[PDB]
UniProtKB/Swiss-Prot annotation:
Record's protein name: Beta-glucosidase 7
GO CC terms of this entry: extracellular region
Gene Ontology terms: biological process: carbohydrate metabolic process
Species whose genome carries this gene: Oryza sativa subsp. japonica
Amino acids binding a beta-D-glucoside: Q24, H125, N170, Q171, Y310, E381, W428, E435, W436, F444
């Protein structure tokens, strides 16, 4: 049932935790003085989210955080990854501070420390203050570095004496892709989109600014707060594994382009101070250039790399063509493939994009180890969802999720046993929550949340964790 897994099976002092994010669990979207984010607007627009749901109440952790902390402690977790709502601190993203908001995260951090749980804090998780979107054009504007840096500065000043583990951003790739390529996330921009946009150029502008913003914030931390606070700052990048369909040159090349356009996009700048060669070759003048000083500032600017790992795909190649630019996605010139040798790569969870493929966990960790000089990596997210409409009892009986973590974790142990620098592992998610476009129709939590009463009940997987992590 534990499949031989336990704390003894991982390096001494390895960190185990669970994850949530502000908008997804806090609730009190329009109270305690909080200002609206782009997701509030988006979520309140009919047709944007399943069943027209939003995060107004969510799991209402804003009121039940202490219950939740007690829960995670009794599950034997060492750490908790959560995010800070920019607009809860700065209703307008700049200027006036919301004291009540500060009070909240103060109370949360203190209670966590009081109960022996280590805070791992994200500064940003999709929730850009609406006011900044309307006034500056959001991440399309280089001015975001200043704005984000001032925001980071206040956090370091205000919680830095107790928070020692920071993350700046969360999956800037999904922002760029879904927000500016496909236009399915706020600000819903893309070539054909009603809000305007350009899927061939904007995705790259956005990513560049994320990187610059990250570097600026880390520069500020390192020059102003690090000495006294002795903290760390990393960044969270999603990485789904890409496997060559066959052993042909063509297919091997494809899988690697996919890797480079997926994770290299951000890792090459962060580790090597430049975008991947292939991207420079293919995207050309649509890819912004880093000035030498910007590159020098970007390179080395992450104390650890958070990887959000979920799934894996087969990749098929093809002769590279000279093409009219249309989209960041089309720039890869690769073909996604379903099965190999007539077998599917793995079964699917509730989410159509989530294929259960344990060995992809190993692919990713190992690849970053081999290709990037083995930097310190943290698995910042890993888990799967159940569908909506099951009975309470069916949720609590998540045998599939139990098998998911046992397998994935076994694969993580294999990569680690082979010398990979993984410092920690975080399960997404602690609670069933607001799953963006899917609203409340997708359940990722190891703890069940009844969205009528908001009661918590731990699932089998919660108990599986409690067993596996006992001291
Ligand atoms: O999917 C649940 C949580 O996952 C995280 O982003 C996901 C990516 O890791 C994955 O590659 O793609 C899916 C769908 O495109 C993303 O949701 C986020 O950190 C969480 O906010 C999200 O709920
Ligand atoms: Zn409440």
């Amino acid at each position: 049932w534990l499949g031989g897994l336990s704390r003894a099976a991982f390096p001494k002092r390895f960190v185990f935790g669970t994850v949530t994010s502000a908008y997804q669990v806090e609730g009190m979207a329009a109270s305690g003085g909080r200002g609206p984010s782009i997701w509030d607007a988006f979520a309140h627009t009919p047709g944007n989210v399943a069943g027209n749901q939003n995060g107004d109440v969510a799991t209402d952790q804003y009121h039940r955080y202490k219950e939740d902390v007690n829960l995670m402690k009794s599950l034997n977790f060492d750490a908790y990854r959560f995010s800070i709502s920019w607009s809860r601190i700065f209703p307008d993203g700049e200027g006036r501070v919301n004291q009540e908001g500060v009070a909240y995260y103060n109370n949360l951090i203190n209670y966590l420390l009081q109960k022996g749980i280590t805070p791992y804090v994200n500064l940003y998780h999709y929730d850009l203050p609406l006011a900044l979107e309307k006034k500056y054009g959001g991440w399309l504007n280089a001015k975001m570095a200043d704005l984000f840096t001032e925001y980071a500065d206040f956090c370091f000043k205000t919680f830095g004496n107790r928070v020692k583990h920071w993350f700046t951003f969360n999956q800037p790739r999904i922002v760029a892709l879904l927000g500016y390529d496909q236009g399915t996330n706020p600000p819903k921009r893309c070539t054909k989109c009603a809000a305007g946009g350009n899927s061939a150029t904007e995705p790259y502008i956005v990513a560049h600014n994320f990187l610059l913003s990250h570097a600026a914030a880390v520069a500020r931390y390192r020059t102003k707060y690090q000495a006294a606070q002795q903290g760390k700052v990393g960044i969270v990048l999603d990485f789904n594994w890409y496997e060559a369909l066959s052993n042909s040159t063509e297919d091997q090349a494809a899988a690697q382009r996919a890797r480079d356009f997926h994770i290299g996009w951000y890792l090459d700048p962060l580790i090597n101070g430049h975008y991947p060669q292939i991207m420079q070759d293919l995207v050309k003048d649509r890819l912004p250039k880093f000035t030498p000083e910007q590159a020098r500032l970007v390179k080395g600017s992450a104390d650890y790399i958070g990887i959000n790992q979920y799934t894996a795909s087969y990749m098929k190649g093809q002769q590279l063509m000279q093409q009219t630019p249309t989209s960041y996605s089309a720039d890869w010139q690769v073909t996604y493939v379903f099965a190999k040798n007539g077998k599917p790569i793995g079964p699917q969870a509730n989410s159509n994009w989530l294929y259960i493929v344990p060995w992809g966990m190993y692919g990713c960790v190992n690849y970053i180890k081999q290709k990037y000089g083995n930097p310190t990596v943290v698995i910042t997210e890993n888990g799967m969802d159940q569908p909506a409409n099951l009975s309470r009892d069916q949720y609590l009986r998540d045998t599939t999720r139990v098998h998911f973590y046992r397998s994935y974790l076994t694969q993580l142990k294999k990569a680690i046993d082979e010398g990979a620098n993984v410092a920690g592992y975080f399960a997404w998610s602690l609670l069933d929550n607001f799953e963006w476009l899917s609203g409340y129709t997708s359940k990722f939590g190891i703890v069940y949340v009844d969205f009528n009463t908001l009661e918590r009940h731990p699932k089998a997987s919660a108990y599986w964790f409690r067993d596996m992590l006992k001291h």
